[model samples]
Target: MDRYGVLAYHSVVDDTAAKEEKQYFPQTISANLLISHFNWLKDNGYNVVSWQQIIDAENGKSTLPEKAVVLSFDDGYATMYNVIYPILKAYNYPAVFAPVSSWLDTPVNQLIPYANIKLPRNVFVTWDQVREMEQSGLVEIASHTDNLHHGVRANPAGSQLPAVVAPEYKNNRYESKTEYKNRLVQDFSRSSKSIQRQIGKKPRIMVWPYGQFNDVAIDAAKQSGMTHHFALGQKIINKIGDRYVGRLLIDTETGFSTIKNFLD
Candidate 1:
């Protein structure tokens, strides 16, 4: 449907942890529960489509079915290969995979250097896995960013902001206006080039990190050919007139009932 919902998720573990332990990790879903959401969509007549299809429809190349949904997974987790891919095929559904391209190349023996903490590399997918998913034709790659998935202190009081939107606080000062602009352009182009080298095509979309974006961020994506962009929000999309498409953030607690509450 032209009016649709975009569900954004992250990691999918074989088994989810206790709610207390998982409170810090919201986006990780349990395998069994994820399949339930898929089953629900199939049974309820919701047509799950790819971003390319949506783009084509936006361009008047094709039409949309009723009750369309787009499934998107972020961070390029290893579960994307070990868990998500086969499920995608079994359902004959298309999905979007977004990643911080730099994180994918980190050696598996080392932890990925995230914003303030290091993350286990084993939990993340590598470029090889990303390319394999792309080859399957059911998965489309979206640039999450080259290295802007984290936050930076933007004020002397240590107020942090998403790197994609804030100029760096470095050398005892925030970056100049032109420096921030150039920074975004550099990161966007780098992510595009890295993905293109591995997947044989430049990404046409970017999943904004931390759901953070501004018009400047939008224009930077435009420069990198990512005219279609997704942000995290709770609203159902009635129509899209521009690149900004808000998505419902699906997390570990997001089961069929929870999803219904949002999508309905």
Candidate 2:
């Protein structure tokens, strides 16, 4: 069987403000926590590679090291820049970032939270920070799209809709599939252009918001240059050439011993 990898983000941090029992960062991303996982991979003879390496290997363009692992970070959170990147640098590792370009200008405390989910603020990495990470050669800038992040997502003027609560997020309100597909394509186009303008690279990697995409999304991704769309739907294996790739769900529920016993 082909080897699989993991995708993580602000899941790792040192939240001085979080209550003692709510500290998800320590085990997921704190310096010590990151090192613990890194050392485990190293000791277990696993080789963690860059996003480019994973891309090449997945597409059969190049070969990866034995037991190769790919670590991806979505939304380009500031913690990944301020906290995780340094740790990755210490280990000379690389990661992938799927950024929603429209939010790059938003301040640390004012980011649009994860769609429909009330995640923390300061959750997205800015373009400035993204540039720094990209230049350092430790990161890759991929697409999470512009408003396609489900912030202002909707159907039509006179369609069934879910009451909007946050600045970003709406419910199924489409009069037709055409409307939905058009909006999704537009989202991909805007982000693709934004990334190209910001980094001189149009991304081939995509991350579905809430991992709640459908056939329309798959078609839009293919039209937009995505080779893979990462998701957290359990019980499925990541496969090469297939647009949907499985991602491990890492939270407080995941840790060192769990890594030792159950994972790659």
How accurate locally, in lDDT, is each candidate? Answer: 0.84, 0.66
Q: What would the per-residue lDDT of candidate 2 be over residues 150-182, giving only the tens digit for each residue?
A: 445333453322211112224543335565577
TM-score of each: 0.92, 0.78
Clashing pairs in 2: 12-29, 13-25, 76-125, 151-169, 155-173
Off by over 4 Å in 1: 22-24, 107-110, 238-241
lDDT of 1 by residue, 1-264 (tens): 567788888877787556556544556778887898999988988899887778788889988788888999998778899999999999999999998898886777899876668888976888888888888889999999998888888887889888888887877898998899999999899999989998998999899987889888899999999978889883467463457777888865677777776677
Best by TM-score: 1
- Model 1, position 27, has a per-residue lDDT of 69
Per-candidate RMSD, Å: 2.0, 5.1
Worst 10 residues of 2 by lDDT: 160-169
Each candidate structure's count of clashing pairs: 0, 5
lDDT of 1 at 85: 93
